[PDB]
Each structure stands twice: as C-alpha cells, then as structure tokens.
C-alpha cells in the first residue's frame, strides 16, 4: 500500500464541500483506511481597486474577494483504489492534487 | 531593380567568370571585387583580399 494525499482546493464554497463529503463517503467502504477531510486556510485574495476611470471628485473604491479554500485528505489504498474514488464528476473548477509516497 | 548586370564574359563556344570565387566558404558565391576589399553575396560578410 501507498499513503496518498488528495489535496483539493476550490474557488467557491458549495463546490468544494460536496466533493470532500463524497470522497469521504465512497472511500469509507472497500480496502481503504481514510483520515478525515481536514480544512486548511482560505488564502483570501484581496484585490483593492479604483472604480472611477476619471480618478475624479470622490471615487468609490471596489474591494475584491477571491477566496480559495483547501481541503486535504490522507488515504491508505492502492493506485487502483485511488482511480475508483477519482471517478466522481467534480465541479468545474475544483483542483485535485495527488502526491504518492509509501 | 537595376539593369544592366551582364558582367560574365563570353568565349567562342565557352563562358568564363569575370569575378572572384570566395576562399572563406566554398565555391558558388561571387566576390564584389573592390581591388582590396571583398564583400560577400549569399549573406553579407566583411572579407579582406587573399
């Protein structure tokens, strides 16, 4: 066997949790021991911008959020038990990284 | 364009080449013979007379 890390991030809240939940449900029952889906930070990205193209009078200034959230999953299964679980549909728009070590 | 450029001389049943053939690269490339300074023809190289 081979301890795999699924490191899964997404740009929006609804898309990331459904995959994290589904990954912990399908893997649960087979030849997998699975450590729980741990939430790491939101590296919230602030873009802080000038609205007005005149830059004139008072110019009201847009605050921007890009929030990118990262769930992490350790798993003890084969490379074949890994693809079976990576079958799932996945939101657009959800990055799934795989490191493989023994 | 620029006419006339008939600078190859004529024998009676043969031809001969007026200009010089380069000694840096092989034959096939003629020299703008200045008398002391050789330009190149294919590309454009500063060559001196050997």
């Amino acid at each position: 066997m081979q301890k795999a890390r699924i490191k899964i991030a997404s740009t929006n809240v609804r898309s990331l949790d459904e995959v994290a939940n589904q990954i912990k449900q399908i893997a649960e029952r087979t030849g997998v021991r699975m450590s729980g889906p741990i939430p790491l930070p939101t590296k919230r990205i602030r873009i802080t911008t000038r609205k007005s193209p005149d830059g004139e009078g008072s110019a009201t200034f847009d605050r921007w959020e890009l929030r990118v959230h990262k769930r992490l999953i350790d798993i003890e299964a084969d490379e074949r038990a890994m693809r079976q679980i990576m079958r799932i549909r996945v939101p657009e728009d959800v990055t799934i990284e795989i490191e493989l070590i023994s | 364009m620029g006419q006339k450029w008939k600078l190859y001389e004529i024998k009676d049943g043969k031809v001969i080449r007026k200009n010089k053939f380069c000694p840096r690269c092989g034959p096939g490339v003629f020299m703008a013979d200045h008398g002391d300074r050789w330009a190149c023809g294919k590309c454009g190289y500063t060559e001196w007379k050997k």
Binding site: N12, T49, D62, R63, W64, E65, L66 | -
Partner: protein, 56 residues
C-alpha cells in the same frame, strides 16, 4: 529607395512601456500583473464573468 525592416528595435527591457494588456492594447494605462494583464477600466467590466465578488 531601399532599406532594412522596422517594427521597433530599441530597448524596452522593463517598466510600463514594456507592458500591454490583453483587451485594450496600452503601455501607460493600467496592467494588473497577476496573470490578468488588463487595464483597471476593463477589470471592472470583466470581473463578474471572472467570479470576483463586489462585496467587501
């Protein structure tokens, strides 16, 4: 007469004149470098399709 090519050939190693956008084609006007080189004015028009959120 005859002359060799030109499409500009001077130094533009770095600065603002080095940059151009991928929407309004400018040097001095804004170039947001996060891998989204556009002016500030485009940025505002484009963002809701990007997925940025107005809310503070």
């Amino acid at each position: 007469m005859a002359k060799a090519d030109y499409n500009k050939r001077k130094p533009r190693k770095f600065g603002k004149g080095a940059r151009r956008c991928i929407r309004c084609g400018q040097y001095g006007p804004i170039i947001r470098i996060q891998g989204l080189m556009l002016c500030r004015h485009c940025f505002r028009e484009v963002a809701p399709k990007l997925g940025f959120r107005k809310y503070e």
